Design an enzyme around this catalytic site. Structure first.
Site, PDB file in Angstrom:
ATOM      1  N   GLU A  84       0.914  -1.165   0.081  1.00  0.00           N
ATOM      2  CA  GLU A  84      -0.138   0.034   0.008  1.00  0.00           C
ATOM      3  C   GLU A  84       0.861   1.436   0.064  1.00  0.00           C
ATOM      4  O   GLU A  84       0.451   2.250  -0.818  1.00  0.00           O
ATOM      5  CB  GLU A  84      -1.002   0.064   1.099  1.00  0.00           C
ATOM      6  CG  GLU A  84      -2.121  -0.894   1.340  1.00  0.00           C
ATOM      7  CD  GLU A  84      -3.053  -0.893   0.141  1.00  0.00           C
ATOM      8  OE1 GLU A  84      -2.962   0.277  -0.371  1.00  0.00           O
ATOM      9  OE2 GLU A  84      -3.689  -1.938  -0.092  1.00  0.00           O
TER      10      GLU A  84
ATOM     11  N   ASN B 284      -7.704   9.675  -5.605  1.00  0.00           N
ATOM     12  CA  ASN B 284      -8.617   8.634  -6.602  1.00  0.00           C
ATOM     13  C   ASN B 284      -9.364   9.747  -7.233  1.00  0.00           C
ATOM     14  O   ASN B 284     -10.229  10.564  -6.696  1.00  0.00           O
ATOM     15  CB  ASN B 284      -9.640   8.203  -5.778  1.00  0.00           C
ATOM     16  CG  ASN B 284      -8.525   7.053  -4.810  1.00  0.00           C
ATOM     17  OD1 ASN B 284      -9.170   6.449  -4.342  1.00  0.00           O
ATOM     18  ND2 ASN B 284      -7.288   6.953  -5.071  1.00  0.00           N
TER      19      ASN B 284
ATOM     20  N   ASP C  56     -13.787   9.593  -7.470  1.00  0.00           N
ATOM     21  CA  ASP C  56     -14.806  10.151  -6.555  1.00  0.00           C
ATOM     22  C   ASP C  56     -13.968  10.890  -5.687  1.00  0.00           C
ATOM     23  O   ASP C  56     -14.560  11.424  -4.444  1.00  0.00           O
ATOM     24  CB  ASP C  56     -15.235   8.803  -5.702  1.00  0.00           C
ATOM     25  CG  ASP C  56     -14.259   7.981  -4.745  1.00  0.00           C
ATOM     26  OD1 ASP C  56     -13.189   8.439  -4.940  1.00  0.00           O
ATOM     27  OD2 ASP C  56     -14.513   7.231  -4.252  1.00  0.00           O
TER      28      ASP C  56
ATOM     29  N   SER D  45     -11.683  11.123  -3.845  1.00  0.00           N
ATOM     30  CA  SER D  45     -11.332  10.791  -2.477  1.00  0.00           C
ATOM     31  C   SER D  45      -9.877  10.544  -2.629  1.00  0.00           C
ATOM     32  O   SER D  45      -8.964  10.418  -3.480  1.00  0.00           O
ATOM     33  CB  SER D  45     -11.920   9.424  -1.968  1.00  0.00           C
ATOM     34  OG  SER D  45     -11.534   8.453  -2.933  1.00  0.00           O
TER      35      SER D  45
ATOM     36  N   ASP E 238      -6.620   8.221  -0.204  1.00  0.00           N
ATOM     37  CA  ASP E 238      -6.098   7.086   0.646  1.00  0.00           C
ATOM     38  C   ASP E 238      -4.697   7.674   1.625  1.00  0.00           C
ATOM     39  O   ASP E 238      -4.092   8.403   0.698  1.00  0.00           O
ATOM     40  CB  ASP E 238      -5.531   5.980  -0.085  1.00  0.00           C
ATOM     41  CG  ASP E 238      -6.702   5.442  -0.930  1.00  0.00           C
ATOM     42  OD1 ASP E 238      -7.915   5.326  -0.621  1.00  0.00           O
ATOM     43  OD2 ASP E 238      -6.472   5.160  -2.286  1.00  0.00           O
TER      44      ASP E 238
ATOM     45  N   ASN F  12      -9.008   5.073   2.826  1.00  0.00           N
ATOM     46  CA  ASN F  12     -10.010   6.032   2.048  1.00  0.00           C
ATOM     47  C   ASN F  12     -10.632   7.042   2.809  1.00  0.00           C
ATOM     48  O   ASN F  12     -11.542   6.735   3.458  1.00  0.00           O
ATOM     49  CB  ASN F  12     -10.763   5.281   0.963  1.00  0.00           C
ATOM     50  CG  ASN F  12     -11.289   6.181  -0.218  1.00  0.00           C
ATOM     51  OD1 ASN F  12     -12.391   6.621   0.016  1.00  0.00           O
ATOM     52  ND2 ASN F  12     -10.513   6.399  -1.411  1.00  0.00           N
TER      53      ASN F  12
END
Ligand code: NA
Ligand code: NA
Ligand code: NA
Length: 133
Positions: free
Chosen positions: A38, A49, A52, A54, A56, A63
């Site tokens: 990750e 991202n 949407d 968003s 992380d 998220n």
């Protein structure tokens, strides 16, 4: 931000100390494998991202649309009740508490696609060997 990266065994040790070993039946090596793919053990890791809007955050790349509030993701719920910036800290107590919350949901650790692709069903013993945990 500039990266702030854990030494592998230090992360293994910290996570164990924080009750991650066996949490929800998830071994330390698995949590270790997830953090590696990750963020490469980078606590300052962020990835937008565009879909949407968003983001992380942290070592576990949590998220903002479902787990932490970053105040810039439309239609979000803050299930960890944490600001996302708390997951961009040297002290990972919050990242841990939030990761524990993520896995309490039905899909558990399968929530992370990277864990399903790089860790699931595969030998992950390499992640804890030599750490004395
Ligand atoms: Na060292
Ligand atoms: Na060193
Ligand atoms: Na330590």
């Amino acid at each position: 931000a500039e990266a702030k990266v854990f030494e592998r065994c230090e992360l293994a040790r910290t996570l164990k100390r924080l009750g991650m070993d066996g949490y929800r039946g998830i071994s330390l090596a698995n949590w270790m494998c997830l953090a590696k793919w990750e963020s490469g053990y980078n606590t300052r890791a962020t990835n937008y991202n565009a879909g949407d809007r968003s983001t992380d955050y942290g070592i576990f790349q949590i998220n903002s649309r479902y787990w932490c509030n970053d105040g810039k993701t439309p239609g979000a719920v803050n299930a960890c009740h944490l600001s996302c910036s708390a997951l961009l800290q040297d002290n990972i107590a919050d990242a841990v508490a939030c990761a524990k919350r993520v896995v309490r949901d039905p899909q558990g650790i399968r929530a992370w696609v990277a864990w399903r692709n790089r860790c699931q069903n595969r030998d992950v013993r390499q992640y804890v060997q030599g750490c004395g945990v």
